[PDB]
Amino acid sequence: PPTEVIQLDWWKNCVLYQIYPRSFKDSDGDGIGDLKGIISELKHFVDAGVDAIWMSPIFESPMVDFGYDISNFYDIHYEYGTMEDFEELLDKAHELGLKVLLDFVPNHASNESEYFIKSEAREPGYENFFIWADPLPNPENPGVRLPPSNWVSQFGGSAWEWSEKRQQYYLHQFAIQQVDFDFRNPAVKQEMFNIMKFWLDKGADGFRLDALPYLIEADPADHEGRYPDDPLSGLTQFESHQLGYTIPLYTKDLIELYDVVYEWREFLDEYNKNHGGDTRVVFSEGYANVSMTMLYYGNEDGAIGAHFPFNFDFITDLSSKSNARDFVYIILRWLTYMPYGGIPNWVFGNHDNNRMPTRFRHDMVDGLNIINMLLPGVAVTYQGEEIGMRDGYVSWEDTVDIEACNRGDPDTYHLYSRDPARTPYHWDNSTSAGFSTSTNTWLPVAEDYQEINLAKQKETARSHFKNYQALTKLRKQATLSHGEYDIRALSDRTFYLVRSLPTHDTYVLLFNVSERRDTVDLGRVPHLTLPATVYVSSIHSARLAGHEITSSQLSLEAGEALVLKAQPI
Amino acid sequence: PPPTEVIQLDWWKNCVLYQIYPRSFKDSDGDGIGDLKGIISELKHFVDAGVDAIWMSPIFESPMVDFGYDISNFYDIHYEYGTMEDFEELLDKAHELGLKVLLDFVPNHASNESEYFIKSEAREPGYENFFIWADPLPNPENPGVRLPPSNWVSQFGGSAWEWSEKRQQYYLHQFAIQQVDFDFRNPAVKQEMFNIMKFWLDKGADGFRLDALPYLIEADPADHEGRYPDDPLSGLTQFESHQLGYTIPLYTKDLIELYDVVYEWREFLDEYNKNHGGDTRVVFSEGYANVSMTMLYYGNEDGAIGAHFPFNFDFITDLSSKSNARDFVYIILRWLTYMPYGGIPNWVFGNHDNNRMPTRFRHDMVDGLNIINMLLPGVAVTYQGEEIGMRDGYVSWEDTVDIEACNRGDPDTYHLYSRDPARTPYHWDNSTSAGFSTSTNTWLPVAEDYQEINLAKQKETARSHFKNYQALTKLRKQATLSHGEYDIRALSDRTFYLVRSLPTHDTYVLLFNVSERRDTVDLGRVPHLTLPATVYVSSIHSARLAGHEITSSQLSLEAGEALVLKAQPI
Ligand SMILES: C[C@H]1O[C@H](O[C@H]2[C@H](O)[C@@H](O)[C@@H](O[C@H]3[C@H](O)[C@@H](O)[C@H](O)O[C@@H]3CO)O[C@@H]2CO)[C@H](O)[C@@H](O)[C@@H]1N[C@H]1C=C(CO)[C@@H](O)[C@H](O)[C@H]1O
Ligand SMILES: C[C@H]1O[C@H](O[C@H]2[C@H](O)[C@@H](O)[C@@H](O[C@H]3[C@H](O)[C@@H](O)[C@H](O)O[C@@H]3CO)O[C@@H]2CO)[C@H](O)[C@@H](O)[C@@H]1N[C@H]1C=C(CO)[C@@H](O)[C@H](O)[C@H]1O
Ligand SMILES: [Ca+2]
Ligand SMILES: [Ca+2]
Ligand SMILES: [Mg+2]
Ligand SMILES: [Mg+2]
Ligand SMILES: [Mg+2]
Ligand SMILES: [Mg+2]
Structure with missing residues (x-):
C-alpha cells in the first residue's frame, strides 16, 4: 500500500502560466490582445493543466513600456478592457479553479501618473514621492549643469532627467517616462500596501513583483549630501551613456530593498490571516547573483520575503551552447543555494527574453518542458512554450520596444528588442493564427504559425501540447509533489x-x-x-x-x- | 549481511599523494636548506601518516631563481639537495617502505643557464629553434625603434619577451626572464621531453607531476601574417601594459595543440608501463584553467587519453573562510559533475604557490578540511604541513626570496605576490628551527607558532590534527571509501x-x-x-x-x- 502524503498549499507545486495579455487573444478585432479574449480562453489553462495564471501589466498606462509605465495603479488599461472585464475574468477563472496573479510594478510610475504630476508641482504630500535631485555643483563651468551622479538607465543613457518645471533632476532606472518612487518615504510604502490591498480585495490571488533589485539607491546623507557615482566597468565597448559603463553598487541590490519585501510579506500574511480562503502570494522578479537572489526568500535572522524569487537560471546560464554537464551543474545551483524549506521554481522564458526553443533548439522543446515539470517545486510556463512557439521576425519598422528604440538603429535593434518573444499566440492556422479576426496585429504574427499552432497539436497523434498535458497531469502523482x-x-x-x-x-x-x-x-x-x-x-x-x-x-x-x-x- | 568483495583499484586511483617541498622539509646538514638526506631520514613519516605516494617539487640542477622551476640540467640533482646517489637511495628506501615517488617535470621552460639556451642563443645547429625566438615587430611609424614581437605579459610581471644582445632577437618567457619557453612545435624539443622522462623512469621514478601545462604552446606567427599576434586587452584600469592582468591570454594559454603533447606523453607512458610491467607509472598535470580546459587534460571526445588526472584546485581557487556550507557543496559538485565518466577525482587543499589551508580558511576548520580531502571519492592530495595544520609563516620584505615578489612587489606590496609564507620550514618538533634544522639560519624564517604547532607535540597529545589525519588515511582502506x-x-x-x-x-x-x-x-x-x-x-x-x-x-x-x-x- 502506497504511503499517504499531506496536501501542499496550492502555490508550492503550481504550474504557473505567464500571460502576455497584448499577445494572447484579441476578442474585438483591433489586433490587440484583451481581457475578454483571455476570458474566452480560460478553458485553455484547464485543458493544459495550468494551476495559476500571472498576467503582465493590465493597469492604466501610456504604453511606453507596454504596461510597465503605469499612470493609474487602480484601474484597467482601456485597450485591454474595463474593471468590469477584470472582475469577470477573476470570477470565471476562480469558477474553473485557477488562481490569478497580477503584475505589480512598485519601483516606478508613469510620468503621466497623478503621483508624478503632483510631485513635479511640489503638491504637499507628493513633493518627496519620487527621487528628486539638484545638479552637481560645477565650480569650473557654473554655466553647464551636471547630473547628480553618472548613474545609467537600463534602457540607455543617464538615469537622471531634468524637469524644467521643478528645476530638479528625477531618477529613472528604466525609461525617462518611468519615475522611481522614494522607498524611504513612508507615504510611498503605504501607497504600495494600498495598491496591493485594493487588488486583493477585488479577489487577486497574489502578485508578481517587478524589478525589485532597483527599489532603493544610496542615500545622499551617507555620501556628504551628494548621490555617489557608480564605479566604472572599464569595458571599452561602453561609453558613459551606455548600459555596462558602470557597476551598479549604489543603485542595485541594496540590503534596504529586502526590508521592503519582508514588510510586504508581513502585510500579505496578515491579509491572509484576516481573510481565509486560498493563500495569496508574491513571486519576485530579480536578476541578481545567487546570494542576493536567495535573500528574497528571507534571511539568516528569520525574516520571510517572497513565497519565492523567480529562478532565471535556464535563461541566464543555459542555452544551445550548454552540454549535459552544464544542465546538471546549473539545475543544482538553485537546489544547493535555496534556503531550507524554500520552494524551488523553474523559468524557461518570459516577455523580456528570447523564446525557449530559440535560446535552445527546436528539437529540445519536449526535454525542456519535461525538466520544468519533473524538477521539484513550481513549473513556470511563458505563453507559447506549451506548443514550442519560436521567436517571430520583427523588422526595424514593426519594432515598438522602447529599449530597442532608445539603444538601437536599424542595424543593431535586434540586439535589444524584446518584441520577437511578444508576437501573437498561435491558436490555429486561421487569419493572424486565430489570435485576431484582423490581419493588422500590434506585432507581426510569426511566419511559422501554419506549422506551430495549438489546434494542429491537439489534432495530431504526437505534439508539444500533448506532451505538456501528460506532464502537468503527472504532477498530481505523489512522486512529483513529495518525491x-x-x-x-x-x-x-x-x-x-x-x-x-x-x-x-x-x-x-x-x-x-x-x-x-x-x-x-x-x-x-x-x-x-x-x-x-x-x-x-x-x-x-x-x-x-x-x-x-x-x-x-x-x-x-x-x-x-x-x-x-x-x-x- | 555478509560484506561484498570489491575489486582492488590500481594504486593511483585512490592514493593519498603528499607534495614534499624539498627545500623546506628536512635539513640533514646544517646549511638551513632541506635536502635529499633529510627526506630519506623521514620517509618513515609517510608510512606513519598513511601517505601512499610522494611528489617532490623540483630537485634538478637549478640556479634557484624560481627555487628549482628554473632548470639548468634536467638529468642531475641540485647540489644543495644532494647527489644522484642520494636520489637513488631515496627511491630505494621509499620503495622498500611501499611508497611511490613522483618527480616534478617542468617541460614549459629551461633556465637561461641551461646548455639548451646557451647553445640556442649562439645558434648552434640543432638548438637554434629550441626556444621561441622572434625578431622585433617592424615599426613603420619610426623604422628601427625596437618593439617587442607582441604585448604578451609574463606571469611574474613585465613583458614576456626578453631582448638577447647576442642573437639580436627576443626570446619568450611566460615566467621569469631566466625561464626560457621551449618551442613545442620543434620535434627535437618534443623528442628531448621523452628523453628526460625516459631517463627518470629508468632510475625507477613512479611518474611525474607536470608543471605549467596551460602555457606550453602559443599562437604560430604563420597564422597571423608572420607576426606574434597581440593578446586582447582586459580594460581593468588597475593594470598597465607591464602588469599581469592587462591582457586576456587568448594566443598564450590553453591552446588546443598543448593537449596533443599531453596525449603523446600519456601514449609514451602507457607504452613504458606495458613494456616494463611493475606498478603503473602516472602523470598528474598542473593546470589553473577553466572547467572545460581543465577536463581536456583527462582526454577528449575523439577518445584520446591524457593525464591520469589534472589537479583539482577548487579548494584553493573557489573556497575560503568567506565560503558557507552551500558554497562548499556547490564547489565540490563541480569536479564530480564535469569530470568524464571513468575519470579519477582528486582534491588539492594547498601547494607551494598558495597560502596554507588553515590561513585560507580558519584554524578551527583544519580537521573538517582534511576529512573532506580523505572522505571524497578518489585521490587525496596533501601539501607539506596540512597534516599538522601549519599556518602561513611571517616573512619580512628583508627575508623575501620569491622572484614573483622581487619582480611585482616593493616593501609595502610584496605580501600580495610572495609565495614564501607557504614555503617556511616544516615543524617537526619544538627544538631549534622546529627540528627542520640544527642551524637557526634557515633559507626562510621558521614560523613564530612552531612551539604550538609541531608534529612531535601532535603525536604525544591525546587529540591532534595528525592523529585525525592518521585515522582518516586508515579509513581509506575501507571498501565504503574506495568503492562507495x-x-x-x-x-x-x-x-x-x-x-x-x-x-x-x-x-x-x-x-x-x-x-x-x-x-x-x-x-x-x-x-x-x-x-x-x-x-x-x-x-x-x-x-x-x-x-x-x-x-x-x-x-x-x-x-x-x-x-x-x-x-x-x-
Ligand atoms: C527588462 C528587465 O531589465 C533588467 O533585467 C535585464 C538585465 O539587467 C540584463 O542584464 C539582461 O540580463 C541578461 C544578462 O545580460 C546575460 O549575461 C545573461 O546570460 O542573461 C540575462 C537575462 O537575459 O536582461 C535582463 C532581462 O532579461 C531588470 O533586472 C528587470 O527588472 C527587467 N524586467 C521588468 C522591468 C521592467 C521595467 O518596469 C519591464 O521593462 C520588464 O518587461 C519587466 O519584466
Ligand atoms: C605560479 C603558478 O602561476 C600560475 O598560476 C597562478 C595563476 O596564474 C594566478 O592567476 C593565481 O590564480 C589564482 C587566481 O588569481 C584567483 O582569483 C583564484 O581565486 O585563486 C587562484 C589560485 O591561487 O595563482 C595561480 C597560482 O596559485 C600558473 O598557472 C602555474 O602553472 C604556476 N605554477 C607552476 C609554474 C612555475 C614556473 O615553473 C613555478 O613558479 C610554480 O612554483 C609552479 O607550481
Ligand atoms: Ca528605485
Ligand atoms: Ca610555452
Ligand atoms: Mg483587442
Ligand atoms: Mg641541508
Ligand atoms: Mg599568487
Ligand atoms: Mg540516493
Missing part, C-alpha cells in the same frame, strides 16, 4: 533526473541535450529497475508512450527526451 | 553532509559546520544514516571524542566542528 530527486550527467550529452518516493512509482527523465546521438548504460541510473514504460517521449523519439524499455543500453537521438515510469523503491 | 557512492548536500548555510555508502559495508558520514556560529541540524535529513552511530573522528575542539555514540537526531555543531560518523550498512 526526492537525483540528478547527474551520464555523458557530455545525456543526463538523468530521477524522482523517487518509497511505495510510489519512480519517474526518470533521460535527456540528450546535444546535437549528436548518445548511448548510455541505464544501469547507472539510481532507482531505475527494468523493464520500465515510456510515460512521455519527444515528438520525434522512436519510442511511443506505452513502449517498454527492457535493455540496459539506450541510444538517444540528438534532442531526444524520455520520461520512464518504473516500479516503486 | 557519495551524496552531498547542505543542511543549512552553516552545515553540510557528505555520506559515503555501499550496500553491506559500513556507512560513513561527514557533518561539517564551516561557519563561525553554532548550528543545530536534524540528522533525520541525512540519507543512509541510522542512529545510533559512532564518532570515528572529531575536530580537536569538538566536545565529542572518537567512540562517542550519537543517539539523538538533533545535533548541535560548534563553529568549525566536524564529525565523521560510522553507521550501520545499507
Whole structure:
C-alpha cells in the first residue's frame, strides 16, 4: 500500500502560466490582445493543466513600456478592457479553479501618473514621492549643469532627467517616462500596501513583483549630501551613456530593498490571516547573483520575503551552447543555494527574453518542458512554450520596444528588442493564427504559425501540447509533489533526473541535450529497475508512450527526451 | 549481511599523494636548506601518516631563481639537495617502505643557464629553434625603434619577451626572464621531453607531476601574417601594459595543440608501463584553467587519453573562510559533475604557490578540511604541513626570496605576490628551527607558532590534527571509501553532509559546520544514516571524542566542528 502524503498549499507545486495579455487573444478585432479574449480562453489553462495564471501589466498606462509605465495603479488599461472585464475574468477563472496573479510594478510610475504630476508641482504630500535631485555643483563651468551622479538607465543613457518645471533632476532606472518612487518615504510604502490591498480585495490571488533589485539607491546623507557615482566597468565597448559603463553598487541590490519585501510579506500574511480562503502570494522578479537572489526568500535572522524569487537560471546560464554537464551543474545551483524549506521554481522564458526553443533548439522543446515539470517545486510556463512557439521576425519598422528604440538603429535593434518573444499566440492556422479576426496585429504574427499552432497539436497523434498535458497531469502523482530527486550527467550529452518516493512509482527523465546521438548504460541510473514504460517521449523519439524499455543500453537521438515510469523503491 | 568483495583499484586511483617541498622539509646538514638526506631520514613519516605516494617539487640542477622551476640540467640533482646517489637511495628506501615517488617535470621552460639556451642563443645547429625566438615587430611609424614581437605579459610581471644582445632577437618567457619557453612545435624539443622522462623512469621514478601545462604552446606567427599576434586587452584600469592582468591570454594559454603533447606523453607512458610491467607509472598535470580546459587534460571526445588526472584546485581557487556550507557543496559538485565518466577525482587543499589551508580558511576548520580531502571519492592530495595544520609563516620584505615578489612587489606590496609564507620550514618538533634544522639560519624564517604547532607535540597529545589525519588515511582502506557512492548536500548555510555508502559495508558520514556560529541540524535529513552511530573522528575542539555514540537526531555543531560518523550498512 502506497504511503499517504499531506496536501501542499496550492502555490508550492503550481504550474504557473505567464500571460502576455497584448499577445494572447484579441476578442474585438483591433489586433490587440484583451481581457475578454483571455476570458474566452480560460478553458485553455484547464485543458493544459495550468494551476495559476500571472498576467503582465493590465493597469492604466501610456504604453511606453507596454504596461510597465503605469499612470493609474487602480484601474484597467482601456485597450485591454474595463474593471468590469477584470472582475469577470477573476470570477470565471476562480469558477474553473485557477488562481490569478497580477503584475505589480512598485519601483516606478508613469510620468503621466497623478503621483508624478503632483510631485513635479511640489503638491504637499507628493513633493518627496519620487527621487528628486539638484545638479552637481560645477565650480569650473557654473554655466553647464551636471547630473547628480553618472548613474545609467537600463534602457540607455543617464538615469537622471531634468524637469524644467521643478528645476530638479528625477531618477529613472528604466525609461525617462518611468519615475522611481522614494522607498524611504513612508507615504510611498503605504501607497504600495494600498495598491496591493485594493487588488486583493477585488479577489487577486497574489502578485508578481517587478524589478525589485532597483527599489532603493544610496542615500545622499551617507555620501556628504551628494548621490555617489557608480564605479566604472572599464569595458571599452561602453561609453558613459551606455548600459555596462558602470557597476551598479549604489543603485542595485541594496540590503534596504529586502526590508521592503519582508514588510510586504508581513502585510500579505496578515491579509491572509484576516481573510481565509486560498493563500495569496508574491513571486519576485530579480536578476541578481545567487546570494542576493536567495535573500528574497528571507534571511539568516528569520525574516520571510517572497513565497519565492523567480529562478532565471535556464535563461541566464543555459542555452544551445550548454552540454549535459552544464544542465546538471546549473539545475543544482538553485537546489544547493535555496534556503531550507524554500520552494524551488523553474523559468524557461518570459516577455523580456528570447523564446525557449530559440535560446535552445527546436528539437529540445519536449526535454525542456519535461525538466520544468519533473524538477521539484513550481513549473513556470511563458505563453507559447506549451506548443514550442519560436521567436517571430520583427523588422526595424514593426519594432515598438522602447529599449530597442532608445539603444538601437536599424542595424543593431535586434540586439535589444524584446518584441520577437511578444508576437501573437498561435491558436490555429486561421487569419493572424486565430489570435485576431484582423490581419493588422500590434506585432507581426510569426511566419511559422501554419506549422506551430495549438489546434494542429491537439489534432495530431504526437505534439508539444500533448506532451505538456501528460506532464502537468503527472504532477498530481505523489512522486512529483513529495518525491526526492537525483540528478547527474551520464555523458557530455545525456543526463538523468530521477524522482523517487518509497511505495510510489519512480519517474526518470533521460535527456540528450546535444546535437549528436548518445548511448548510455541505464544501469547507472539510481532507482531505475527494468523493464520500465515510456510515460512521455519527444515528438520525434522512436519510442511511443506505452513502449517498454527492457535493455540496459539506450541510444538517444540528438534532442531526444524520455520520461520512464518504473516500479516503486 | 555478509560484506561484498570489491575489486582492488590500481594504486593511483585512490592514493593519498603528499607534495614534499624539498627545500623546506628536512635539513640533514646544517646549511638551513632541506635536502635529499633529510627526506630519506623521514620517509618513515609517510608510512606513519598513511601517505601512499610522494611528489617532490623540483630537485634538478637549478640556479634557484624560481627555487628549482628554473632548470639548468634536467638529468642531475641540485647540489644543495644532494647527489644522484642520494636520489637513488631515496627511491630505494621509499620503495622498500611501499611508497611511490613522483618527480616534478617542468617541460614549459629551461633556465637561461641551461646548455639548451646557451647553445640556442649562439645558434648552434640543432638548438637554434629550441626556444621561441622572434625578431622585433617592424615599426613603420619610426623604422628601427625596437618593439617587442607582441604585448604578451609574463606571469611574474613585465613583458614576456626578453631582448638577447647576442642573437639580436627576443626570446619568450611566460615566467621569469631566466625561464626560457621551449618551442613545442620543434620535434627535437618534443623528442628531448621523452628523453628526460625516459631517463627518470629508468632510475625507477613512479611518474611525474607536470608543471605549467596551460602555457606550453602559443599562437604560430604563420597564422597571423608572420607576426606574434597581440593578446586582447582586459580594460581593468588597475593594470598597465607591464602588469599581469592587462591582457586576456587568448594566443598564450590553453591552446588546443598543448593537449596533443599531453596525449603523446600519456601514449609514451602507457607504452613504458606495458613494456616494463611493475606498478603503473602516472602523470598528474598542473593546470589553473577553466572547467572545460581543465577536463581536456583527462582526454577528449575523439577518445584520446591524457593525464591520469589534472589537479583539482577548487579548494584553493573557489573556497575560503568567506565560503558557507552551500558554497562548499556547490564547489565540490563541480569536479564530480564535469569530470568524464571513468575519470579519477582528486582534491588539492594547498601547494607551494598558495597560502596554507588553515590561513585560507580558519584554524578551527583544519580537521573538517582534511576529512573532506580523505572522505571524497578518489585521490587525496596533501601539501607539506596540512597534516599538522601549519599556518602561513611571517616573512619580512628583508627575508623575501620569491622572484614573483622581487619582480611585482616593493616593501609595502610584496605580501600580495610572495609565495614564501607557504614555503617556511616544516615543524617537526619544538627544538631549534622546529627540528627542520640544527642551524637557526634557515633559507626562510621558521614560523613564530612552531612551539604550538609541531608534529612531535601532535603525536604525544591525546587529540591532534595528525592523529585525525592518521585515522582518516586508515579509513581509506575501507571498501565504503574506495568503492562507495557519495551524496552531498547542505543542511543549512552553516552545515553540510557528505555520506559515503555501499550496500553491506559500513556507512560513513561527514557533518561539517564551516561557519563561525553554532548550528543545530536534524540528522533525520541525512540519507543512509541510522542512529545510533559512532564518532570515528572529531575536530580537536569538538566536545565529542572518537567512540562517542550519537543517539539523538538533533545535533548541535560548534563553529568549525566536524564529525565523521560510522553507521550501520545499507
Ligand atoms: C527588462 C528587465 O531589465 C533588467 O533585467 C535585464 C538585465 O539587467 C540584463 O542584464 C539582461 O540580463 C541578461 C544578462 O545580460 C546575460 O549575461 C545573461 O546570460 O542573461 C540575462 C537575462 O537575459 O536582461 C535582463 C532581462 O532579461 C531588470 O533586472 C528587470 O527588472 C527587467 N524586467 C521588468 C522591468 C521592467 C521595467 O518596469 C519591464 O521593462 C520588464 O518587461 C519587466 O519584466
Ligand atoms: C605560479 C603558478 O602561476 C600560475 O598560476 C597562478 C595563476 O596564474 C594566478 O592567476 C593565481 O590564480 C589564482 C587566481 O588569481 C584567483 O582569483 C583564484 O581565486 O585563486 C587562484 C589560485 O591561487 O595563482 C595561480 C597560482 O596559485 C600558473 O598557472 C602555474 O602553472 C604556476 N605554477 C607552476 C609554474 C612555475 C614556473 O615553473 C613555478 O613558479 C610554480 O612554483 C609552479 O607550481
Ligand atoms: Ca528605485
Ligand atoms: Ca610555452
Ligand atoms: Mg483587442
Ligand atoms: Mg641541508
Ligand atoms: Mg599568487
Ligand atoms: Mg540516493
